Each structure stands twice: as C-alpha cells, then as structure tokens.
C-alpha cells in the first residue's frame, strides 16, 4: 500500500521531465522572439528624423 | 520521466525484501534440521510435537 500510494502521488505531485522541459523551451523562445521584434520595433520610429529635416 | 519516485525500484525493493526473508527462512530449518522452530511455522505441529517428544 505505500508503493501503490507513493506512484499515486507522484503522478499528482511530480513533473513530467520530457513533457516540462520541452514545454520549458518553448517559452524560452518566444521571450527571444519578443526580445528580437522589441529591438526592431524601437527603430520604426527613429525614420521621422530623416522626414524632419 | 518523473524523477522525485522511483516506482520501479522501490517496487523491486519490496520484492528483494521478500526473497531474503524467505531464504532466511528456509536457513533456519536447514541449520536446525527441524521443521518447526517457531510455533509459526505450525501451531498443531508444534504442539503434537511436545506431546510426542513427552511421551
């Protein structure tokens, strides 16, 4: 009865391993995609310098 | 992969702490020649037994 309950909490309780770090990844990309669009997207304004003058 | 619980060794613990026991077990009655050492192992032998030994 403590096999059968200690796998019954673990699966309640512990991560999935595979399925955590291949989620863990996934995020850990999209920040970059924000961080590489939020650079460009300082940018697009700095163009009305040139219509300025 | 969940790593906090191994359930396959510590189900493979149990089963190692049941053959050692009997092994055990079956020493005791080897070293001994007897079948009944404690009254356990048979409690209508064991008490046949002690009449039979009386007698």
Same mark, same amino acid.
Do not use: F
């Given at each position: 009865?403590? !096999?059968?309950?200690?796998?019954? !909490? ?7 391993? *595979? ?35 | ?7 396959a ?13 009997? *092994? ?18 048979? *409690? ?9 030994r009386?007698?």
């Amino acid at each position: 009865s403590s !096999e059968n309950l200690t796998s019954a !909490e673990s699966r309640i309780r512990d991560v999935d391993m *595979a399925s955590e770090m291949m989620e863990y990844t996934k995020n850990n990309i999209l920040t970059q995609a924000s961080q590489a669009m939020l650079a460009q997207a300082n940018q697009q304004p700095q163009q009305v310098l040139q219509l300025l003058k | 992969m969940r790593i906090n619980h191994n359930i396959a060794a510590l189900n493979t613990s149990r089963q190692l702490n049941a053959g050692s026991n009997a *092994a055990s077990k079956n020493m005791e009655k080897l070293s001994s020649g007897l079948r009944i050492n404690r009254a356990g192992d048979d *409690a209508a032998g064991l008490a046949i037994s002690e009449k039979m030994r009386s007698q």
